[PDB]
Design a protein around this nucleic acid. Sequence first.
RNA 1: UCGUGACAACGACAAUGGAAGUACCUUCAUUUCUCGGCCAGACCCAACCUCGCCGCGCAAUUUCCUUCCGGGGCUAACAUCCGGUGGGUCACUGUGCGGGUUUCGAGGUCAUGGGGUGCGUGAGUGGGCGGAAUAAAGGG
RNA 2: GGAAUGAACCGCUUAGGGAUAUGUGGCGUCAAAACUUGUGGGCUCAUUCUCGAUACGUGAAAAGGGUGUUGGUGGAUAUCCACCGGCCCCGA
RNA 3: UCGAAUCGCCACUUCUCUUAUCCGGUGGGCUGCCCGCCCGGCGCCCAGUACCUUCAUUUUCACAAGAUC
Lengths: 152, 221, 178, 49, 143, 99
Amino acid sequence: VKANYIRAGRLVRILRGPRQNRVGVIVDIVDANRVLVENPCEQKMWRHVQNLKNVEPLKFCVSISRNCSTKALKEALESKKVLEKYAATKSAVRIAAKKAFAESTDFERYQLRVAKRSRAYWARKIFDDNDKKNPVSWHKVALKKLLKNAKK
Amino acid sequence: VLPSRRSLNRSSRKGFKKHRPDIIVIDLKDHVLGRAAAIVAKQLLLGKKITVVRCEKLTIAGSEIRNKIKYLQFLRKRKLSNPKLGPFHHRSPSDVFIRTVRSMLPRYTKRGQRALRQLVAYEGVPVNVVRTGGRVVIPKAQRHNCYRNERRFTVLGNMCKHVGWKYSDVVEKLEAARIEKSGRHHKKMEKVRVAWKNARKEALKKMPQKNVEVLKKFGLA
Amino acid sequence: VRPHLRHYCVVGRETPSEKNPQPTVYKFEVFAPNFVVAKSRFWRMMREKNKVKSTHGDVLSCKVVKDRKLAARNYSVDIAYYSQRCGYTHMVKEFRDVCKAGAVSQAYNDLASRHRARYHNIEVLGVKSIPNHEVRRLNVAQFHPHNLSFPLLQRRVKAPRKDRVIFVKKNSKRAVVA
Amino acid sequence: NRRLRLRLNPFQKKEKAMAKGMQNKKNREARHAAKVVRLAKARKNVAKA
Amino acid sequence: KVSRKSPEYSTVRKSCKPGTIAIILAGRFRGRRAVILKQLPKNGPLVISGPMKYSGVPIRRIDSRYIIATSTRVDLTGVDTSAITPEIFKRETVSDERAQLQNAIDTALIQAIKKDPLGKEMAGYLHSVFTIKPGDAPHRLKW
Amino acid sequence: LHGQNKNTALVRIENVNTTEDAKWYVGKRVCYVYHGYKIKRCVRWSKAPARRSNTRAIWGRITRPHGTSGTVRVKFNGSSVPASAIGRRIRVYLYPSRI
RNA sequence: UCGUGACAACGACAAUGGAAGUACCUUCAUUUCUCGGCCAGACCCAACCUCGCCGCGCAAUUUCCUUCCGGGGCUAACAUCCGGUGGGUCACUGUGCGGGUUUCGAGGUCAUGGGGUGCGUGAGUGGGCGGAAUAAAGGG
RNA sequence: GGAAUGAACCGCUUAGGGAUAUGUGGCGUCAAAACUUGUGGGCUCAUUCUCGAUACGUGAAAAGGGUGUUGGUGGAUAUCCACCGGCCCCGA
RNA sequence: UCGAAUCGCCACUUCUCUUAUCCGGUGGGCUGCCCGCCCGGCGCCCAGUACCUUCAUUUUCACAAGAUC
Ligand SMILES: [Mg+2]
Ligand SMILES: [Mg+2]
């Protein structure tokens, strides 16, 4: 009941196959199962057929006509600059992060471990000083209750 | 399964306190009965220890009357000479699931009998498994991935109630108490969860800047 | 790329003799998986229409026809099939596709599903790219209007084969087994 | 097997050298361009007839 | 042009070069990092010595099939490694001349490491150990 | 369906699930670890007396992938692995390394 | 066929049998003890068998591509479609095939034989080992 | 070696053994193979001998019906009539 | 008495519901589009990102010769 509609100008992300995780624009609808996709500004991504089970619709949409030329599509993309807006989305960031880890060189993997350990160390220290006052953890709450047993 | 005195003396001599083997706990709510059993049977044969809970929420395709008639036809089969030797018709949902899994195993060999002994089935979530860790699901046997929305299905608990199961009300009362108890505790322990999230955000401002740049590049912070 | 039943054009004639020098040259269109099947269909039609058998004939050419560019179109296919109960049935169907070969491949799969007719009991009479405002089928003409849009519901999504799992945690994406 | 192939056919060395020249990058691009020109020119002249 | 009879002849994979950083896969030093120094005269084993004050691995021989050669390389032009010879291992509580050789090699190796722009990160990298955690897939990595 | 051949064994490895993944493990050494009931001879029985135990191991190697889902075929040197190992743990080492 | 002492274990598939291992015995046969006819691992040569990467021939690629005008159609257009006009010198989906020695990045053989260049009558045959030479004839 | 089971069906026909590849038949579990393959189309919902699902194997079924649903053909008018198929249902 | 096989753990996971569903929640403007607003973790070798310090002769693989119970 809440979904991004399939229409001319809607941006989609490919799920599987050779063009996995690429972004294209729907330029035409043939039937209930297939569409035509093109991305002028990216390598590969010429006009081709795609099954509707292999795409995911995004929030962004361009204002073009059905079966528009690759030129008019190009200016429409440039004017709206939706490609830049999609790149700044959280979901796009996660996909790029997953790729960078797959192409790491095992020395940057060590660097990532050092950075994650440094952040965890500082979080533990900050949490501890904020727990000495205003007890939150189980041991500080229990200690306060036990210190209340001071009638001896 | 209750330890004898011999086990108690041996553990005391060697200073052993507690031990928990590797066990996977599966929440079977809104899972297809046949597809869940087939996946569980293969994993048992590969040497896994599996405990399933909420067996009364398993689903079978078709109307309730169709599945009720199917069970009654099974109940009619018995050894005429001596029914106490004939096939046994268990009525609880957990017993129905165990029978289904047993039919997908080499049950007449020691290897098959050992695999069946590694499975424990429950109705609801008993008190001894509540605090054991996070439960898992099987995406290839989930209802929203298997049935078309317009078809009619049957909940196993409702089917068993009308063919002989006598503890449907008992299980319902126990489940209501567990949701209340767990919900209260999860509403508690939110101040600690918020405090931990705030500490991580307070970090990246005291930690070294070079390590912060690395985290940004890998999309972690 | 996807469709089977490529588009073939076969040109042949009868071997000249001293009763019939310079025989007529015929041209035939057929949709077949490969050219060996395409030539087999050509000689069947030549025998049942001109009394010329493959033993007394030659094949001059057998190539693949190139289609137009990629676009959404309406295709009209007039087709016939045989069954023992009813004999020969002739019909005209319409499909949405991007090429002639795709539309004919659709028709063959559609006839198998709806009438249980196999490949060798089917004859194709023609395929044409017809404009809008000339389609008599509502299920095809509903894709014509501009501003057409619809949502995707009841999706069955699957992970890439490299990342499929068996058991997964209930409140996260962390895999447990596999 | 290389020595058995040469033993059975002493022309193998020159046959393979032709294939390597066929695969060479500069020669194959010139051959592609020359073929297009030759075919196009004959098409225009035949039409003008 | 190198003949099989010549000592300089060798058939080892191109990733295993002097100055390469490798992960030990088997033995008492499994999971630790080290630096490849040279290869023995004939087609023999490699000689590895991760800076012993860094990883704890002394001068040793190792087979090329029991190390994973990473892409991190430290320039080794300064270190001569001429004293390394098959006779030191041939001889069958460490000895004085063995300790002196180890100290001389370690001093040159440490200076060469510090010469690299990422010298401090390299020193920490050599301290780290490698292990297979539950849920890891070494076949998907790049090294 | 006719029966089994005990000269080849099938091993399922965690997090492989693909033929291209199983090709990375061709030629790697594997072993099955179990225990007996009295101490017998072992490697370095004299040099390292701390190794003496009831523990035993049977070694083998990976030959080729099996199926399309990451299963591999293993041959255990010159003999079969005992059938009491069906469903138990198998160690897959990372040597000999091609990387 | 039966008794006894010691031992081996064993649910309920009637027992018996076949194949392949293993756990405990046996001390039966053979070999070795400063070299071993034992157990592993890696390396080299030949042979056979795989994988990566790079390519070619052929009017197969014109029932085609592009520009314009005239219909027609939709909404204000554009588009699907029909006639023509003028141009046509990163993938274009058929069919036959190649590539490591003045070298085109690897792997497997516990599924083969080696003396594993030692050597003295135990026959490295190699575009691959030696020693001469430098575009030698044969292609676009 | 396959069709669960079967003298005659399907494949193949046989000295003692390894490696490689196929035939018939298969790839949810039993049970090796799609850890439930496709980034392929349609059709079907079946209440007490319980919808259907490997030929030979009749080794389970007819005439006659259905405003169940999904396709065609020929006529009329800005939707109506007649006829013919597919799966399912009654006859059972 | 026992030499044994197993090799992630958490009092941030260890509550609930949905998939014709604001995929964290939640408003407005003119079908559908547009514009807003508020908010799993650690673990892999310095108890922490500084570059200080012990490792050997167990001298090239062998059940981790070490842990847990
Ligand atoms: Mg030479
Ligand atoms: Mg299987």
